Amino acid sequence: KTCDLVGEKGKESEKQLALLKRLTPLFQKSFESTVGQSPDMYSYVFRVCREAGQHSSGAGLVQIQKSNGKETVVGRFNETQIFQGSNWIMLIYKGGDEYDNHCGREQRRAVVMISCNRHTLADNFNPVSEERGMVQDCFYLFEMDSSLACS
Amino acid sequence: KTCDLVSEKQLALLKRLTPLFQKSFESTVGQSPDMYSYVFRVCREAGQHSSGAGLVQIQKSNGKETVVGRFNETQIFQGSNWIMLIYKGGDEYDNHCGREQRRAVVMISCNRHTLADNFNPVSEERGMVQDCFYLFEMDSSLACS
Numbered sequence A: 001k002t003c004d005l006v007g008e009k010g011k012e013s014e015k016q017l018a019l020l021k022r023l024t025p026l027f028q029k030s031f032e033s034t035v036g037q038s039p040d041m042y043s044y045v046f047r048v049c050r051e052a053g054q055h056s057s058g059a060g061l062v063q064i065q066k067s068n069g070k071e072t073v074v075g076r077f078n079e080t081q082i083f084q085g086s087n088w089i090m091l092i093y094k095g096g097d098e099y100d101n102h103c104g105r106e107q108r109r110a111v112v113m114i115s116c117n118r119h120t121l122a123d124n125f126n127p128v129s130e131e132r133g134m135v136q137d138c139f140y141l142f143e144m145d146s147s148l149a150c151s
Numbered sequence B: 001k002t003c004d005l006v007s008e009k010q011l012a013l014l015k016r017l018t019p020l021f022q023k024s025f026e027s028t029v030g031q032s033p034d035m036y037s038y039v040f041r042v043c044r045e046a047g048q049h050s051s052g053a054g055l056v057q058i059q060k061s062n063g064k065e066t067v068v069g070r071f072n073e074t075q076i077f078q079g080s081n082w083i084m085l086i087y088k089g090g091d092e093y094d095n096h097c098g099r100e101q102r103r104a105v106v107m108i109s110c111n112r113h114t115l116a117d118n119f120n121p122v123s124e125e126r127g128m129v130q131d132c133f134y135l136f137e138m139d140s141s142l143a144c145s
Ligand SMILES: *[C@@H]1O[C@H](CO)[C@@H](O[C@@H]2O[C@H](CO)[C@@H](O[C@@H]3O[C@H](CO[C@H]4O[C@H](CO)[C@@H](O)[C@H](O)[C@@H]4O)[C@@H](O)[C@H](O)[C@@H]3O)[C@H](O)[C@H]2NC(C)=O)[C@H](O)[C@H]1NC(C)=O
Pocket: B004, B051, B052, B070, B072, B073, B089
């Protein structure tokens, strides 16, 4: 019912479990941000290791078309990767819904850069961009502030 | 002889990093036989073989050079107070990551006090079937909003 790590198990995997544990106070929260202009107005909902979608799909981050509440899963938390930088944490959710035309029809993916901010536990979640111009390895990029990424 | 993208916003971002082009950033890390020295440059040759390397990994034990990413294949994104620079096209792995080409992802965070400093490796994700990557960080006032 929480984040599941993907990758090789070992010393590094063990460190990533520790990072997820540190983010526990954020689990109960839900972050949202609406961007874009009609007919492409989108609302992104992001959560840390908890269901961010409306259909129990295991979504960690979803995209909702404002015009018509169509929900698209950007990434699932059962496919998480996480890394600790000096003043930030990079959180990745793979296994989102598949593209039909772009990116070799691969599953969508979310990359969230959580930067250190001593003033708040969590705030300023914002979509940065969607890299959908590659034949593979595409991603939706986001940012958010959190004191938990600080040294 | 400069970064080649795959976007007007991206070209503007590259332009913004111009003052870093002439610099060379180095950082040694790890413990032999796994001690590596990383050399990173923005849109300029970081290697010794004119291969177009934007970031190379040097094995300190024997001086062997491995290209992590080529500025021949650059992607760049701008967050509120950070810039993400990506160089794909590095040397291929022999065993990890389906033998794909190495890749470098550099998180350039805002720091009002320096034009560019604190370049360092953060981690190497080499446990995936594909889309592996070397993660780095560095500070720069140019990343500040
Ligand atoms: C960006 O610049 C890169 C460096 O200049 C480009 O890399 C080169 O890309 C070409 C075209 O895809 C590759 O050509 C292939 O070569 C292999 C043989 O590879 C092996 O032998 C060569 C020569 O001895 C050696 O350089 C390689 O490392 C391998 O040992 C052929 O079997 C294929 O048919 C094809 O000709 C080059 O191999 C590749 N060289 C490298 C890694 O620098 C890259 O394509 C450019 N990307 C762009 C256009 O954005």
